[PDB]
Write a protein that holds these residues in place. Structure first.
Motif, short mmCIF file in Angstrom:
data_model
loop_
_atom_site.label_atom_id
_atom_site.label_comp_id
_atom_site.label_asym_id
_atom_site.label_seq_id
_atom_site.Cartn_x
_atom_site.Cartn_y
_atom_site.Cartn_z
N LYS A 146 0.44 11.91 6.81
CA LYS A 146 -0.01 10.50 6.58
C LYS A 146 1.03 9.54 7.14
O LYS A 146 0.62 8.55 7.79
N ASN A 171 0.88 -1.20 0.00
CA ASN A 171 0.00 0.00 0.00
C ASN A 171 0.90 1.23 0.00
O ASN A 171 2.11 1.08 -0.23
N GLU A 172 0.34 2.42 0.22
CA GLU A 172 1.10 3.69 0.16
C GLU A 172 1.94 3.88 1.44
O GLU A 172 3.04 4.44 1.31
N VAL A 173 1.46 3.45 2.62
CA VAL A 173 2.25 3.58 3.88
C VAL A 173 3.44 2.63 3.76
O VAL A 173 4.55 3.01 4.17
#
Ligand SMILES: Cc1nc(NCc2c(F)cccc2F)c2c(-c3ccnc(N)c3)c[nH]c2n1
Ligand SMILES: [Cl-]
Length: 336
Positions: free
Chosen positions: A251, A223-225
């Motif tokens: 974030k 994912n993005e994290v």
């Protein structure tokens, strides 16, 4: 019925196109290898789905590489050539030149061992020329989906490559689509929701060249994290001057007392920031990636240091300072 067209094989379109095989499906629809009866040559045809989203994206792609065709320059040859286009059976159809399998298939051929630094060097040079051509002021085209899959060999027994798939492509000051770049190749400016320029394609080229030689993805986020936390493992926390101007910075990170930035929790755990050295990933002094190039000709520590320096210029957190096509082509890694 549905988005797609009619796959048959043996069918002949417009008493001109003899359809023999499907190369591969994409989000946009299909690509098929056919024979041109009037030009006496093989062609790959991009068949766009019967939807507004993909049709609108195809119209942009058509417009952008028509623009590339005007330019008198040898460099334009590292972008896939569009011969013609026509709508048929309610579908937009782009006829391109026939090329070969992508650089992800070439890596799958070696069982993800990677190709030689000598071949990685040839790829790195042709792509740096291609990114240069894109950066011509009149063009200023940001591909926005550079990845091994969109880099094709011309012939399977040779090193020449080209860029394809300009459906996701825009032009410098534009913010058209919600989502740009493939997650593994997504530059940090795009992860933090900051404005993007032609610099993001150079960050993608950096990740791609390391994968070409190590045989596996540099930053493989789920994912993005995950993506940002794994880029942080190699390159440390991004510059505070960057995180302080980024909409989605909070974030992944947190502002501290000193005006400093530390990571958030794993929620539920990565290698501490900058401790996953690009030195050991390439194995500059331990015989190349996973020790597999030890003793091997053209795989000296000197050669690995020049490749390493150039990749680190391309993986600059700062899009203002990150290496530009004209100057990456002057690097010692290419010196004759
Ligand atoms: C063998 C082969 N293959 C090609 N395509 C490989 C391929 C797929 F098979 C499926 C999805 C994307 C893709 F690039 C192409 C394309 C191509 C294709 C799509 N967009 C553009 N702009 C160009 C042109 N010549 C090709 N030759
Ligand atoms: Cl996320």
């Amino acid at each position: 019925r549905g988005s797609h067209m009619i796959v048959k094989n043996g069918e002949k379109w417009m008493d001109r196109y003899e359809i023999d095989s499907l190369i591969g499906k994409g989000s946009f629809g299909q690509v098929v290898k056919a024979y041109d009866r009037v030009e006496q040559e093989w062609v790959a045809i991009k068949i766009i789905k019967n939807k507004k989203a993909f049709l609108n994206q195809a119209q942009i792609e058509v417009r952008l590489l028509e623009l590339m065709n005007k330019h008198d320059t040898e460099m334009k040859y590292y972008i896939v050539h569009l011969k013609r286009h026509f709508m048929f059976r309610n579908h937009l159809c782009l006829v391109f030149e026939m090329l070969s399998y992508n650089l992800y298939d070439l890596l799958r051929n070696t069982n993800f061992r990677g190709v030689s630094l000598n071949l990685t060097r040839k790829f790195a040079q042709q792509m740096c020329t291609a990114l240069l051509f894109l950066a011509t002021p009149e063009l200023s085209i940001i591909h926005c989906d550079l990845k091994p899959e969109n880099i094709l060999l011309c012939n399977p027994k040779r090193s020449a490559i080209k860029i394809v798939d300009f459906g996701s492509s825009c032009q410098l000051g534009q913010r058209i689509y919600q989502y740009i770049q493939s997650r593994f190749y997504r530059s940090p400016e795009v992860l933090l929701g900051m404005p993007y320029d032609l610099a993001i394609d150079m960050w993608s080229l950096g990740c791609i060249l390391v994968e070409m030689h190590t045989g596996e993805p540099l930053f493989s986020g789920a994912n993005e994290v995950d993506q940002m936390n794994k880029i942080v493992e190699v390159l440390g926390i991004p510059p505070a001057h960057i995180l302080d101007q980024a909409p989605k910075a909070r974030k992944f990170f947190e502002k501290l007392p000193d005006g400093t930035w530390n990571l958030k929790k794993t929620k539920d755990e990565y290698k501490p920031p900058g401790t996953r050295k690009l030195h050991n990933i390439l194995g500059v002094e331990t015989g190349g990636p996973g020790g597999r190039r030890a003793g091997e000709s053209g795989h000296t520590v000197a050669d690995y240091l020049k490749f390493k320096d150039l990749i680190l210029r391309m993986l600059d957190y700062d899009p203002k300072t990150r290496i530009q096509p004209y100057y990456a082509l002057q690097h010692s890694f290419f010196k004759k």
